[PDB]
């Protein structure tokens, strides 16, 4: 039995949107201490690494440093800033429900936390949610959600997911102060936060819609390529055109491997 099944023994979910109210009972003191340790460790590590918008979202959303946050209390601030809410889910959900959530400004957050010794509540909430404070990033995510139906209609969801992976989960952003991180999967990771900026090993490549959507990724370890945007506005702009011809042109195409450099990459 996996972590999700194990964590969810005895609980339920809405039949339509796979949400539940956050099971606030069921958090044990060990959950709060684990949350606090993880939060603490990231907060000491992230200055001069996370983009400023991330660190600032933690503050403005008052993401508890010493316990798993109350989703509702967080939603009060999140709704007021950008019209988004978080919804508690049991873990991985059907993609149809996920896109529909994002299209509706609901951000699905796994309710449970890893054990001290899968996306969990730390990755989903610490990693993803602080950035929903940035209106352009907030709109990009909504646009992404809506983009689900066209990609589904075209059998191109894997191409859309690569885009999401390489921006929302593992995106880097170039600033006048140097490279910073906006990808949630990095930001909730001690070692990957270090690696993605410090190491000479991974490829660091200028964002390019078509290349990203034709690029495989790594699910069990650090990424081998990171894609770098100039701003949230550039990212929103570049992802505003009709994706339909892009999806069709890549239909019979062979994808770049997670570690490839493409002939026309802007490499760093
Ligand atoms: N422009 C995309 C929608 C989208 C926007 C932003 C992110 C992902 C997808 C389309 O034509 O389908
Ligand atoms: Fe994530």
Nearest ligand to the CA atom of 110: 2
Distance 183 CA to ligand 2 centre (A): 8
The reply to whether ligand 1 has any atom less than 6 angstroms from the CB of 245 is no
Q: Strands, E, within the chain: which ranges? A: 85-89, 106-110, 172-175, 178-181, 203-206, 225-229
Say if ligand 1 is within 6 A of residue 243 CB: yes
* Domain ranges (residues) in the chain: 1-268
| Nearest alpha carbon, ligand 1 atom 3 | 147
Mutate to test the pocket of ligand 1, among 138, 232, 239, 248 (most ligand atoms within 8 A of CB): 239
Q: Is 169 annotated as a binding residue?
A: yes
Q: What is the position in ligand 1's atom list of the atom closest to the CA of 244?
A: 11
Percentage helix, strand, coil, to 5, in the chain?
50, 10, 40
- Rounded alpha-carbon distances, angstroms, from residue 23 to 69, 112, 197: 12, 9, 37
- How far is CA 180 from each of CA 104, 106, 170, 226, rounded to the nearest angstrom? 28, 26, 11, 11
Resolution in A: 2.1
Contacts of 230 (CB under 8 A, 6+ apart): 173, 174, 207
Cβ atoms within 10 Å of 265's Cβ, excluding its own: 17
Q: Which is the closest atom of ligand 1 to the Cα of 240?
A: 1
Residue 54, CA distances (Å) to 81, 114, 196, 225 in order:
14, 22, 16, 22
* Ligand (nearest to CA of 108): 2
Angle at 179 between CA 175 and CA 183, to 5 degrees: 100
Q: Which helix (H) or strand (E) holds 150?
A: helix 135-153
**Structure obtained using:** X-ray
Contact at 8 Å (CB) between 47 and 55?
yes
Q: What is the C-alpha to C-alpha distance for residues 267 and 227, in angstroms, rounded to an integer?
A: 9
Please check if 13 is assigned to a binding site: no
The reply to whether ligand 1 has any atom less than 6 angstroms from the CB of 69 is no
The Cα 81–Cα 63 span in angstroms is: 14
CA distance 98 to 104: 10
The CATH fold assigned to 1-268 is 1.10.800
């Amino acid at each position: 039995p996996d972590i999700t099944t194990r964590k969810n023994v005895g609980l339920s979910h809405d039949a339509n949107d796979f949400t539940l109210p956050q099971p606030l009972d069921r958090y044990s003191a060990e959950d709060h201490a684990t949350w606090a340790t993880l939060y603490q460790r990231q907060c000491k590590l992230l200055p001069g690494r996370a983009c400023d918008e991330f660190l600032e979202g933690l503050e403005r959303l008052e993401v508890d440093a010493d316990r798993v946050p109350d989703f509702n209390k967080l939603n009060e601030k999140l709704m007021a800033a950008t019209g988004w809410k978080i919804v508690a889910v049991p873990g991985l959900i059907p993609d149809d429900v996920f896109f529909e959530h994002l299209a509706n400004r609901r951000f699905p957050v796994t309710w449970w936390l890893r054990e001290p010794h899968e996306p969990d509540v730390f990755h989903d909430l610490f990693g993803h949610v602080p950035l929903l404070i940035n209106p352009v990033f907030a709109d990009y995510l909504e646009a992404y959600g809506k983009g689900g139906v066209k990609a589904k209609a075209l059998g191109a969801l894997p191409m859309l997911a690569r885009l999401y992976w390489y921006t929302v989960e593992f995106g880097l952003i170039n600033t006048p102060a140097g490279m910073r991180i906006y990808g949630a999967g990095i930001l909730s990771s001690k070692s990957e936060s270090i690696y993605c900026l410090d190491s000479a090993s991974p490829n660091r490549v200028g964002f390019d819609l078509m290349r990203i959507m034709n690029t495989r990724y790594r699910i069990d370890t650090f990424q081998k390529t990171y894609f770098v945007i100039d701003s949230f506005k550039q990212l929103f702009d570049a992802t505003a055109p009709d994706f339909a011809p892009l999806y069709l042109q890549l239909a019979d195409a062979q994808p770049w491997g997670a570690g490839d450099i493409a002939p026309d990459d802007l490499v760093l």
